[PDB]
Design a protein around this ligand. Structure first.
Ligand SMILES: [Mg+2]
Ligand SMILES: [Zn+2]
Ligand SMILES: [Zn+2]
Lengths: 50, 388, 76, 901, 55
């Protein structure tokens, strides 16, 4: 989900509460900020959003 | 027979009749006398017939008016349409119709789904389209989006050039310098390099796309001229004068706008009417709303049932929902309330308060096994025993 | 300058005196607590000099009978 | 000797009342005993009442089934806090001084609050608000205005534990637990005058009685042992809880009398309190639910009442009532409107009890001689003492010679008996009415056709229920209050609701149509069929070519109307207003023109009746239709109900006869149009499509003005829909123009008997735009509805506009669009029923208590006056003409004509 | 004074119950009719002993 503030969240069924998106990507071994940005595309506005 | 004689005879014989009945009788008797030369005997016979008919038409004690009114309201609704329409008119404002509207009025929701105000005009501005448009501008609640012919939201280089149409500007009565002056007087922390027929904005050197997007949308829908919470206005011409229909709900503010006739002005939101004009006005507005909603669907319902419902709703100064939230939920009969709840604390509260159940209802008497005090359950009989 | 009583939706209001109040109360065999109530914050009350515990006579304009009298009591 | 409970006032029992009301002091926790006998001093004593068979009650001396049971009491060792009153007790403690016990409030505040309470007594919500306000004001105070003593804060711990936060000599706050004895001592000192402000009545609920000192024991009937399939006496949960209560009470008492330490006394006190709380309410907050012997929560007093199927909410229900039947219905107009046909088999089961008297002894004797097999027979006979016997065949010959005054015979249904008739769902008042029985063969509830509208019934498998009242009072109520005759005028809008529907209108038009004449044979036959009492034909009007006499339909119809009826109005067939204007001019000029002049000016669009003679006009829906039945309304409101019933029962049969023997049909050629009309429709459609394409092009090239209410696309859609609707209306107008009145379908539409002009338009000329939720069809593939259109197309043909009528046949895409429209209609029909039902239920629950008092006022169930002079004029909506109290115009005209004639 | 239809219904019910219980009929009636139409005819003739009390 994307909240009204522009911050992304992930809702895992077991986890009682949503997690921030970058935390979830880093838990999966994708730690680089550059790589995290690259994994979702290259459109500059999207890059600025992330 | 001089008209004074007819009036005197009416007052002499039909003194029991209501005022409207005797007035209408006088009018039509005058017309028929001037057309057919009636004598006094016919007038006396006519008045006696009217009195007898009125006496026959009176309701008898013990009639269960409440159940009859409830049924006569509920039954037509089953034949009435069930929303799921989008009436797209040109000189009209979308308004919830039919069953949803009836439910909203009956449950007295705080804010209607489609608030709408009817604004009349004083004598000066009533008989001209241009003065009506002027009052509209006073009440238009004009927004930059409506003024703009089109908008270009180009975030790629941090600017926002919105194209303003001259015709909408002329209709609103505002000029580019005027609107820019108002905007800067409101948006102090901004720089407006207005050029030609385009507005140019900058968010005090913002950094991220989202910030400028939010700032641009903040300006786009920002109000320039007009009372709060008012959208489009459709000035029509009904009868002979021009009447200003309007969206939104600012019933107390609009009454102070010059050129607005406050006596005839009405609004959809009944709660606002209760706040501004009082509770009797709220009752009358409820009656009129239900009548109009029934009429637009072609159904016919007697005014008396709606009057009873409205009187029952506004029984204690404040308009309350007729359902279990405001009327049923406060039933005095603890037995009647008992078979509507999930807890037993109401029994303890009633016992503490020493509440007395008068058994004046229906459910409690039915549960006990006693005649309901309506209709034939009201009468008492006596007889003189010596019989032939 | 604009008074609420000039609006078509607002019928005329009046304040009853003690004698007529008691005559009305005796006519229907009722007490003060059994009448409909109008809050002290109602604009019609403010336009008048009404005080709590008083009975307001309302002269409705009825679609069926033309003139019709309704009564309310003032509470907090 | 039989009185009626007029009111029930609730209060709080006092310990003295519980002591004297009860009979046996239960002390020993004794069960049913091995031999199933009540043990003395046990929970089920004989003074409590007996449910076990073969023994007598100790108190009343009644055998099981006739002893109502009796109450017993338990003497508690220590005070116990009632769970329900715990919050009330806590609120009271925070409002009264610890020393004096009076309300911590100033006298002026007391006076003001007393006045406000006296004013707002009836309104429960406002009373609670005032109580809460006073409670807050008193609790916020710290120094008693009377004593000046400090009031240490009282803390409430759920469910029944109270802590007094006191300050030691060092200022530290420590929680002092208030034992129930302390609470009782606090509560006793509260004076009576302070109770009304505190929210109490000092005659039925005193605060000291909230803390229980004596616990009453319900009688054995109230806690019966239902036993088990194995024969084990499965006890009541209340019985087990009472046993535990008795055990713990005896234990606490014996340890108290033994000088036990304070800790063990406190332990037993808390055990007693917990057991009492779980016995009163096993689901009280903060209370562990006591487990049954099987480990399930025990059903206790609270659970026994707050059940949907319990005493509350459960007694009101719908079950199989006695003496009822249900079967499909079939039509027949040969019976009166207030009659119903009953199958023989049903009539031989739904017996009605009749007491034999002197004037009906022989009829009942014959009936009981018939036995329970011949139709005019009986099934049960009751002797004056009270025994019931079945007639059968063994003692059929007797029970008749020994039948005299004072017996009761349960005879079969016979003609003339009163019977209710119901159709579910029952929406308005007219869904139940009383009919007269007429036993006929086969198995269907025959119903007259004029009675269909109020029931809202169609003969396509609909079923109906009938109930047979048994007692004389119920029969009289049904006969006088509920008969079909009295309910002709609908209470809703004040007009008729019973009248002709389909043939009664079309056949009436055929009979009264201009230029319709009947021969002597037809006249006599139809008059005899209608039941009209006649014995000489009127003078013939016009002679046939070969010499036979003829009669116009207008005179035949006039033979039914009363002798002094006079009325005139405009019907639905008025298409040339000039003729109506001329007729109105003449009538208004004279008020009684010579009937010869009217004949030359006759016009079937203008009904005019003079002294019961139909002079001009034709019969249509406005005569005696479902609504706006001018003539039927006039008959009802001026000649009594019986005359109206006779008139309806005659006109129905007359019209049915004329339509049956005159021929009425409809074929495939009823919607055949001439070539010119087809060309006109085609060119209209083509022009509309061209305009729509022009609009689309203008939108595409940016030439569009968006009105403020809509964007560009929404404005485009609005314009398209308006254009298409206007085109459909124009096509319908053309089709209606080219369709003559002699067409049977056009007759049915115009007279209002059945169908609308839109139906003819759709069947002949054009079907029109199809919409979902008021919008053009849009839900489909990406940018197109179907797959056979180019994507991004907004043309009329591609978004639900169908150009083929039903006669021409629809192309597959048009068929799919029509299917979408029909599906939407069906869904709306399905949902609106539930929504309307919910709203009606709410309204009825709110308003079902109001009634008209004997002085004309309408009073709420709690005594508040809702409306003086109900309706602000006192006129019943049924008795009102059409909303107006008195139609003085009709009164003036009728009186003037009657006296000037 | 005019009988409301509820009053008439109650009067008819009471009279029919009394006639069924064994009370004599104040007017001659055709044979083979139930108590109900007997009471209805009694009311129609205007011969009614029972009266109503109004507050
Ligand atoms: Mg059906
Ligand atoms: Zn007993
Ligand atoms: Zn004190």
């Amino acid at each position: 989900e994307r909240r009204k503030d522009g911050i992304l969240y992930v809702d895992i069924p077991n986890v009682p509460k949503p997690v921030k998106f970058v935390y979830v990507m880093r838990a999966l071994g994708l730690e680089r900020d550059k790589d995290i940005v690259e994994a979702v595309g290259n459109d500059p506005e999207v890059q600025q959003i992330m | 027979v001089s008209l004074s004689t007819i009036k005197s005879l009416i007052e002499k014989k039909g003194a029991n009749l209501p005022e409207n009945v005797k007035s209408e009788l006088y009018e039509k008797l005058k017309k028929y006398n001037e057309k057919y030369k009636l004598t006094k005997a016919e007038i006396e016979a006519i008045i006696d017939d009217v009195v007898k008919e009125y006496e026959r038409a009176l309701v008898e004690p013990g009639e269960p008016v409440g159940t009859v009114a409830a049924q006569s309201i509920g039954e037509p609704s089953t034949q009435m349409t069930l929303n799921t329409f989008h009436y797209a008119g040109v000189a009209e404002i979308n308004v919830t119709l039919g069953l949803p509207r009836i439910i909203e009025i009956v449950d007295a929701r705080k804010n209607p789904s489609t608030p709408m105000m009817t604004v009349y005009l004083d004598e000066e501005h009533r008989y001209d389209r241009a003065k009506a448009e002027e009052v509209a501008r006073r009440i238009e609640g004009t927004t930059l989006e409506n003024l703009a012919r089109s908008t270009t939201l180009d975030l790629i280089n941090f600017e926002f050039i919105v194209e303003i149409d001259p015709e909408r500007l002329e209709r609103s009565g505002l000029t580019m310098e005027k609107v820019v002056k108002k905007l800067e007087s409101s948006f102090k922390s901004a720089e407006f390099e207005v050029d030609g027929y385009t507005l140019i904005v900058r968010p005090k050197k913002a950094d991220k796309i989202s910030d400028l997007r939010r700032f641009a949308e903040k300006i786009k829908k920002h109000r320039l001229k007009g009372l709060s919470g008012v959208g489009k206005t459709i000035v029509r011409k009904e009868g002979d004068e021009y009447v200003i229909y309007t969206e939104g709900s600012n019933f107390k503010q609009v009454l102070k706008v010059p050129g607005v006739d406050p006596t005839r002005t009405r609004t959809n939101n009944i709660h606002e009417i209760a706040e501004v004009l009082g509770i009797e006005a709220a009752r009358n507005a409820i009656i009129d709303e239900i009548v109009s909603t029934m009429q637009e669907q072609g159904l016919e319902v007697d005014i008396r049932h709606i009057m009873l419902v409205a009187d029952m709703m506004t029984l204690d100064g404040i308009v309350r929902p007729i359902g279990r939230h405001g009327v049923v939920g406060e039933k005095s009969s603890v037995l009647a309330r008992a078979a509507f709840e999930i807890t037993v604390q109401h029994l303890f509260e009633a016992a503490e308060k020493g509440e007395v159940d008068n058994l004046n209802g229906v459910i409690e008497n039915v549960l006990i096994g006693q005649p309901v005090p309506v209709g034939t359950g009201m009468v008492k009989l006596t007889m003189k025993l010596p019989l032939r | 300058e604009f008074s609420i009583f000039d609006h078509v939706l607002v019928p005329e209001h009046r304040v009853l005196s003690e004698e007529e109040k008691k005559a009305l109360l005796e006519k229907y065999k009722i007490t003060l607590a059994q009448l409909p109530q109008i809050k002290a914050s109602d604009p019609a009350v403010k336009a008048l000099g009404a005080k709590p515990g008083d009975v307001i006579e309302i002269k409705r304009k009825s679609p069926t009978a033309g003139v019709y009298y309704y009564y309310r009591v003032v509470v907090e | 000797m039989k009185k009626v409970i007029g009111s029930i006032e609730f209060g709080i029992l006092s310990p003295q009342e519980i002591r004297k009301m009860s009979a046996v002091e239960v002390t020993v926790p004794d069960t049913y005993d091995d031999d199933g006998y009540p043990i003395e001093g046990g929970v089920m004593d004989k003074r409590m009442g007996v449910i076990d068979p073969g023994l007598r009650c100790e108190t009343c001396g009644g055998r099981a089934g006739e002893c109502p049971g009796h109450f017993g009491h338990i003497e508690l060792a220590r005070p116990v806090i009632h769970v329900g009153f715990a919050k009330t007790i806590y609120r009271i403690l925070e409002s009264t001084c610890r020393e004096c016990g009076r309300i911590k409030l100033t006298d002026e505040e007391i006076e003001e609050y007393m006045k406000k309470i006296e004013l707002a007594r009836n309104r429960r919500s406002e009373f609670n608000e005032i109580i809460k306000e006073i409670h807050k004001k008193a609790k916020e105070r710290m120094v008693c205005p009377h004593c000046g003593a400090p009031q240490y804060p009282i803390k409430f711990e759920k469910p029944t534990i109270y802590w007094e936060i006191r300050k030691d000599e060092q200022g530290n706050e420590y929680r002092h637990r208030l034992m129930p004895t302390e609470v009782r001592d606090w509560l006793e000192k509260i004076p009576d005058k302070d109770l009304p402000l505190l929210g109490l009545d000092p005659e039925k609920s005193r605060p000291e009685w909230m803390v229980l000192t004596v616990l009453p024991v319900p009688p054995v009937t109230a806690r019966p042992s239902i036993t088990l399939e194995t024969g084990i006496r499965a006890e009541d949960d209340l019985t087990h809880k009472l046993v535990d209560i008795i055990r713990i009470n005896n234990r606490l008492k014996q340890n108290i009398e033994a000088g036990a330490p304070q800790l063990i006394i406190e332990d037993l006190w808390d055990l007693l309190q917990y057991h009492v709380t779980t016995y009163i309410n096993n689901e009280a907050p903060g209370v562990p639910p006591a487990k049954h012997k099987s480990g399930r929560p025990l059903k206790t007093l609270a659970q026994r009442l707050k059940g949907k199927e319990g005493r509350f909410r459960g007694n009101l229900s719908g079950k199989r009532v006695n003496f009822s039947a249900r079967t499909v219905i079939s039509p027949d107009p040969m019976i009166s409107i207030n009659e119903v046909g009953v199958p023989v088999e049903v009539a031989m089961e739904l017996t009605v009890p009749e007491k034999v008297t002197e004037f009906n002894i022989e009829r009942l004797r014959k009936m009981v001689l018939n036995g329970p097999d011949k139709y005019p027979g009986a099934n049960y006979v009751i002797d004056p003492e009270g025994r019931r016997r079945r007639i059968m065949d063994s003692n059929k010959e007797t029970l008749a010679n020994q039948l005299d005054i004072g017996w009761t015979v349960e005879r079969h249904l016979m003609d003339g008996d009163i019977v209710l008739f119901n159709r579910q769902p029952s929406l308005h008042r007219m869904s139940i009415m009383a009919h007269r029985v007429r036993v006929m063969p086969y198995r269907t509830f025959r119903l007259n056709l004029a009675v269909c509208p109020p029931y809202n019934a169609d003969f396509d498998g609909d079923e109906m229920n009938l109930h047979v009242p048994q007692t004389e009072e119920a029969q009289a109520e049904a006969r006088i209050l509920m008969e079909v005759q009295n309910h002709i005028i609908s209470p809703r809008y004040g007009g008729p609701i019973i009248g002709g529907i389909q043939d009664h209108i079309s056949g009436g038009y055929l009979l009264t149509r201009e230029g319709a004449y009947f021969t002597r044979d037809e006249v006599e036959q139809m008059l005899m069929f209608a039941g009209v009492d006649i014995t000489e034909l009127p003078e013939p009007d016009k002679y046939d070519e070969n010499g036979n006499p003829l009669w116009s339909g207008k005179t035949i119809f006039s033979l039914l109307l009363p002798e002094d009826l006079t009325v005139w109005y405009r019907n639905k067939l008025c298409d040339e207003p000039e003729r109506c204007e001329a007729l109105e001019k003449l009538i208004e000029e004279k008020l009684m023109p010579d009937p010869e002049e009217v004949r030359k000016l006759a016009y079937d669009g203008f009904v005019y009746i003079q002294n019961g003679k139909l002079l001009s006009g034709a019969i249509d829906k406005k005569a005696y239709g479902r609504e706006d039945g001018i003539i039927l309304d006039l008959i009802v409101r001026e000649y009594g109900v019986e005359r109206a019933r006779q008139f309806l029962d005659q006109v129905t049969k007359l019209t049915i006869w004329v339509i049956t023997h005159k021929g009425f049909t409809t074929g495939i050629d009823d919607e055949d149009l001439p070539e010119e009309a087809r060309d006109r429709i085609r060119e209209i459609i083509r022009e509309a499509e061209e305009r729509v394409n022009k609009l689309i092009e203008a939108y595409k090239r940016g030439e569009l003005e968006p009105l403020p209410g809509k964007s560009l696309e929404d404005t485009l859609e609005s314009l398209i829909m308006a254009v298409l609707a206007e085109a459909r209306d124009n096509a319908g107008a053309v089709a209606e123009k080219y369709l003559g009145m002699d067409n049977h379908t056009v007759i049915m539409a115009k007279t209002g008997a059945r169908g609308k002009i839109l139906n003819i338009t759709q069947m002949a000329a054009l079907l029109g735009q199809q919409s979902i939720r008021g919008k053009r069809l849009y839900r489909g593939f990406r940018g197109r509805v179907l797959s056979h259109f180019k994507p991004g197309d907004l043309g009329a043909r591609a978004k639900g506009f169908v150009v083929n009528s039903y006669k021409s046949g629809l192309t597959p895409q048009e068929y799919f669009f029509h299917a979408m429209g029909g599906r939407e209609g069906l869904v709306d029909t399905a949902v609106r029923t539930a929504q309307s039902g919910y709203m009606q239920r709410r309204l009825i629950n709110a308003l079902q208590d109001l009634k008209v008092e004997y002085d004309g006022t309408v009073r709420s169930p709690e005594g508040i006056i809702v409306q003086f002079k109900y309706g602000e004029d006192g006129v019943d909506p049924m008795k009102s003409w059409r909303g107006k109290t008195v139609d003085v115009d009709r009164i003036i005209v009728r009186t003037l004509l009657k006296m000037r004639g | 004074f005019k009988y409301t239809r509820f009053e008439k219904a109650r009067i008819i019910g009471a009279r029919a119950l009394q006639i069924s219980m064994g009370a004599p009929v104040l007017i001659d009636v055709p044979p083979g009719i139930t108590p109900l139409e007997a009471a209805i005819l009694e009311f129609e003739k205007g011969v009614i002993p029972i009266t109503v009390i109004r507050p």
